[PDB]
Amino acid sequence: ATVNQLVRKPRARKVAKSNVPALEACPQKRGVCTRVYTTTPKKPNSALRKVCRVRLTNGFEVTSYIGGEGHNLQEHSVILIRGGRVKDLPGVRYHTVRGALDCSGVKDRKQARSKYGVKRPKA
Amino acid sequence: ISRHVAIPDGELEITAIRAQGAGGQHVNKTSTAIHLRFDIRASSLPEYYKERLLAASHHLISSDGVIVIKAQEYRSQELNREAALARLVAMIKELTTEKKARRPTRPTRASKERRLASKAQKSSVKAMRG
Amino acid sequence: ISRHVAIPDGELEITAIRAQGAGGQHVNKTSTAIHLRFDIRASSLPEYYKERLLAASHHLISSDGVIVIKAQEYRSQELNREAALARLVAMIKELTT
RNA sequence: AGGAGGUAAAAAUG
RNA sequence: CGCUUACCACUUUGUGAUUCAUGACUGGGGCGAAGUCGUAACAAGGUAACCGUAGGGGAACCUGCGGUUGGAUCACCUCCU
RNA sequence: CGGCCGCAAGGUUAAAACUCAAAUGAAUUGACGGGGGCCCGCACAAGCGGUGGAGCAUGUGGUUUAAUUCGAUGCAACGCG
RNA sequence: CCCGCAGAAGAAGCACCGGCUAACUCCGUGCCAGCAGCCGCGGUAAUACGGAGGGUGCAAGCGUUAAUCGGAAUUACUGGG
């Protein structure tokens, strides 16, 4: 027990690290989305995945994978982001939401159509 | 391939001004033969390179592009001409080397070893329900 | 200042001959559309470039200086020639400048 | 069965 | 009323502490890539290795000093009782 | 990094960002040792007759050519298909 | 709030289906396009990528993201080494 060592050094309520260094408790953040590129994944896979660096409006210069098909962004193209990582590209811990003021969705993705901010086809 | 130095005569203004340094009274009276260049950007003619010779910073060329080379080593005016004529070639052609490098790099022999590998790890994920 | 020209010589072989590598059964018999060239050595580029490129262990060349370049990653022959020609532009000046 | 003593040469790399 | 002493906020100035961004350039770390050459380390890895300290060196590392086992190896041949 | 100590090399105290989803302990198994034991085989020792040297027949490589068909090409290919 | 008209008329989509964790086949492209919280799926026969059929969960709400707690006896006085 060593209660005398505990009466001096208390039980440390260890604060864990955050997986989202954007801002405190922010659901989303607006990014200046700069320098579009496409790089290769790690040992699990191999592909040509479209990604983009994010100049954040809170000051950060982070990276984010572009999960989608339709390329509706360029040099600037200020978009929004949602948390979460891809687990296959060493370095990215964000996602480019396909439903921002700037970035729209991709057409004809019927199965689970709310994905990629795709507008539901009434046809 | 076919290399013959042009450097247009009647297009280059050569200015002979006095020198600098030590050496007695000889160096300050008849050392005006020393040369200083004058190569304006208006005598370009490649249309794309001369502006790339002006934008990228380097010496011998100011903020306007009137390229000057004040050569102070020789005693004759003759040697000042050719020595200053070589550096103009040695600056411009050296700086116009805008390397058409290339790219890229995409794994082509990684996935001939990486591919069979992970699929063989499927037996590693069989430690469960049957 | 010094007019340097990267002019295409006439002493180079533009012959649509066999490609070199793999590809199943088409690579062993027919093999067309790949510009495998030869830059005849005893010709122009007046001795300054000829033996200058020969005193260097290099790929895609002969032992005599009749440079054999392979142009593979292009679909049309207009671009395959560009793959062959543009390589030689960079290739000879690589062992020159 | 205990016990003492004696005994031997180098040779790299996939 | 007017004048004046003392106290005081603000401002200005001199000289420091501390803290936050940014800084050409430069070093160390990780990752992918795995192009290069090495094949250290692991069977005693073909020189057993690890720790501390010092020097050397293109790289893994090498060598001297001391310590630990988180290291091996114990047959025949000759002879004797 | 700062503090402290030291002549110096450094020592002590002691983080973070970032990055991976593994790192590690125990004992189990095959393999190798110029490791040992025990044991076998023309392995050696004890002898006999051959190859290699000469010519000839045949096969392969290399070379050459309009083609010298192709495959096998350490033991276990080369009088092989 | 009550009485009458009252054509079912005007009133259902969202996620997911390899396992974790309820639910299956086919087609198209071939470690390419892409998916995911974790292990991972995709090398011309994909129950994991895209679509279609069907199914499961929930419901005027359903998923995603972020934050707190429990899970976590991974700060253990209760209650660890």
End-to-end CA distance of chain C: 18
Q: CA-CA distance, A105 to C54, in Å (whole number)? A: 57
Going by C-alpha positions, the residue among C15, C62, C17, C16 that lies closest to residue C42 is C62
- Tell me the two tokens of residue A66: 């572009």
**DSSP letter for each residue of A39-50:** E---TT----EE
- Angle at the Cα of C13 (from C8 to C14), degrees rounded to 5? 85
Q: Which residues in chain C have Cβ-Cβ distances shorter than 8 Å to B67?
A: none
* Conformational region of residue A108, where left means phi above 0, alpha means psi within -120 to 50, and beta covers everything else: left
Q: Which residue of C has its CA nearest to B2?
A: C5
Residue with tokens 């116009």: B96
CATH superfamily of A1-123: Nucleic acid-binding proteins (2.40.50.140)
- Tell me the two tokens of residue A7: 């009466």
Q: CA-CA distance, C31 to B9, in Å (whole number)? A: 54
Q: CA-CA distance, B31 to B19, in Å (whole number)? A: 6
CB atoms within 10 A of CB B41: 14
Rg, chain B, Cα only: 29
Q: Are A90 and A44 in contact (CB under 8 A)?
A: no
**DSSP letter for each residue of A70-94:** -----SS--EEEEE---SSSTT--E
Task: List the resolution, Å.
Answer: 3.7
For the CA of C45 and the C1' of F5, the distance in angstroms is 74
Backbone φ, ψ for residue B65 (5° rounding):
95, 60
Those residues whose C-beta lies under 8 Å from the C-beta of residue C54, and which sit 6 or more positions away, are C64, C65
CB atoms within 10 A of CB A92: 22
Q: Are A51 and A40 in contact (CB under 8 A)?
A: no
Nearest 10 degrees: CA dihedral of C26, C28, C31, C34? 120
- Tell me the two tokens of residue B113: 């070893």
Cβ of A45 near strand E (distance < 7 A): no
End-to-end CA distance of chain A: 70
**Nucleotides in E strand less than 7 A from protein CB:** 30-35
- Tell me the two tokens of residue C58: 């290099």
- Tell me the two tokens of residue C78: 């207009």
Q: CA-CA distance, B87 to A93, in Å (whole number)? A: 53
Q: How far does Cα C84 stand from its chain's mean position?
A: 6
Handedness of CA B102, B106, B112, B117 (dihedral sign): positive
- Strand-pairing partners, residue B71, are B35
CB atoms within 10 A of CB A96: 23
The amino acid occupying position B55 is A
**Nucleotides in F strand less than 7 A from protein CB:** 17-21
Q: Can you list the pairs that B6-9 forms with residues at least 24 positions away whose Cβ atoms lie under 8 Å?
A: B6/C1, B6/C2, B6/C3, B7/B85, B7/B88, B7/B89, B7/C1, B7/C2, B8/B43
Those residues whose C-beta lies under 8 Å from the C-beta of residue A99, and which sit 6 or more positions away, are A80, A105, A116, A117
DSSP-derived letter for residue A56 is: B
Verify whether the Cβ–Cβ distance B106 to A48 is below 8 Å.
Answer: yes
**Alpha helix locations (H) across B27-113?**
49-55, 77-95
Q: Are A98 and A117 in contact (CB under 8 A)?
A: yes
Q: Are B99 and A35 in contact (CB under 8 A)?
A: no
| Residue A98: HSE in the Cβ half-sphere, 13 Å Cα cutoff | 19
- Tell me the two tokens of residue B5: 């130095």
Going by C-alpha positions, the residue among A84, A86, A71 that lies closest to residue A36 is A71
CB-based burial label for A35 (10 Å; 0-12, 13-18, 19+):
exposed
CA distances from A119 to A36, B10, C65 (A): 25, 69, 63
DSSP-derived letter for residue B117 is: H
Q: CA-CA distance, A34 to A27, in Å (whole number)? A: 21
In a mutational test of the B interface, the residue from A39, A43, A46, A49 whose CB has the highest number of chain B CBs within 10 Å is A46
